[model samples]
Target: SKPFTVPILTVEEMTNSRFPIPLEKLFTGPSGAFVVQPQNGRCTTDGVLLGTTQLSPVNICTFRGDVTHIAGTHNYTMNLASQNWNNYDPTEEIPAPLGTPDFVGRIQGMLTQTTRGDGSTRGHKATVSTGDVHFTPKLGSIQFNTDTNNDFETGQNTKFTPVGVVQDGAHQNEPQQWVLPSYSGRTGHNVHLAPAVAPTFPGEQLLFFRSTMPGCSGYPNMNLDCLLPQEWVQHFYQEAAPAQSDVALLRFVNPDTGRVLFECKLHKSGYVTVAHTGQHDLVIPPNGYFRFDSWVNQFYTLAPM
Candidate 1:
């Protein structure tokens, strides 16, 4: 039972700039998790010419989010609102730094693990919006005991990672993945991908990519309500905020993955940015130093016992 990966962006040992590089693998659902972009994506980068601010390189796979069937000890919750970014531009590479006036552009607060569970996952807090302040994560706390999971939760993930970053030979060829992205739904958000005594039309169906034009530029994603709301497609199934640290707070939404954000197969709610180049909803823009990823709704039914 293992499946969580999104690693095919090679051809670099240096600043080849994110693999011959640029937005193409950009699929954030059906959960193999994606968003490996870069091209026209800020022509050689420039964070206000290095004084800084312009970081957008989001990545995700919150442990193969889009869950199947959760079992025992669960407590997840995530609320939304202008995600994070905005700070020191070195590798988070000026995600939109061509001029000035835009902020909240880079934040690398990450967490990584391929498979090491002496299995303990404890309270890990995160409270972003980093840049003119609202920052609360130097790593709140953690306890993973596969003998050294977080090595003491510290800082950064390419300075961003909708979650996932160890690049350098790149995922190596995928599939060995120890597991992580519990859920993100809409791949036929159903009662069966091909199961359940036979049925593909029991309920739920969201693949998203219908809405258009959210090619955000800088400042004014509606004065910091900060993107990701045109009824924000792809409903239900959102687990993974139980951090060890390097970014794994994908604002929970899984009621134990019985599947159901409950509605919206789409009248038209699609999005993509970070340079996928069209129909945008969110990239957390609250004027510099933004930190998107919330929800400590704190899920229910506790104890790993």
Candidate 2:
């Protein structure tokens, strides 16, 4: 989706700074895919942005208001100039960098006679660097940078943040911390990320099953979906390695379609090797997901066989 401005955060108030800012503090995605938008501007250039309070407040205020300009003096909401709000997962994270033309245009377009900034004789222009970041916690960091021409010839230095950034195409070439359709639960995310269910289903192990069994046949080609009636499953009370148990047909429900696909019989030991042909062939890669009888999160182990 082409980025749209979040109008709700509008009507700006300027400031040089604001601290101990009321921030939500934390947020992420499915299959280990996620982005954090701190409500309180908690993003740190050094240490991790998402941290813990241990007790109160409950929710992680990860997403920020939208965008703010360098001229945006305060560390609070006013700093956000504009952002890809809907992209935050409905989920997490906010804040973004802008392009040159856009940086200049929005500032120029935003600052009318009524909204005069520091009211200087000089106009405010800047080489916008849409500092867009799609971060994964396990990995370190990925960044893009870019710069725009002039918001001003004289006060340019003070008008922008990251004084160290050079406005060249590569230096600070980033985009608005916008959303991606793939991760937004549109068609289904890249992989299954089981939400951390503490004490929910304690002893259950987390297993991921992909199509290709790696070193086996189809060694090179990998299936994104686990070839099974559903993505994942468990044995429950059915007994591990059932030697003489009856075929327990487990119905795996699809999260997207919401219909019970078909029942694949688990071996007496409680493992379903294959589904009804078109369903799923096998479980490779080692993890899977689905809504089953009282199953916990997305993580799964091979049905105990």
lDDT of all predictions: 0.19, 0.21
Candidate 1 per-residue lDDT, tens place, 27-118, comes to: 12222243211111121100111211123222221111111111232211122112333332223333222111122222122323222235
Tens digit of per-residue lDDT, candidate 2, span 144-233? 111322232321212222211122233222221212112212222322221121111223221212221111111121121111111011
Q: Which ten residues in a row have the lowest lDDT in candidate 1?
A: 190-199
Q: How close is every model to the real structure, measured as TM-score? A: 0.18, 0.20
**After superposition, which runs of candidate 1 have C-alpha atoms over 4 Å from their true positions?**
1-40, 44-57, 60-102, 105-119, 122-125, 133-305
TM-score for candidate 1: 0.18
Model 2 TM-score, all chains together: 0.20
lDDT of 2 at 251: 48
Best by lDDT: 2
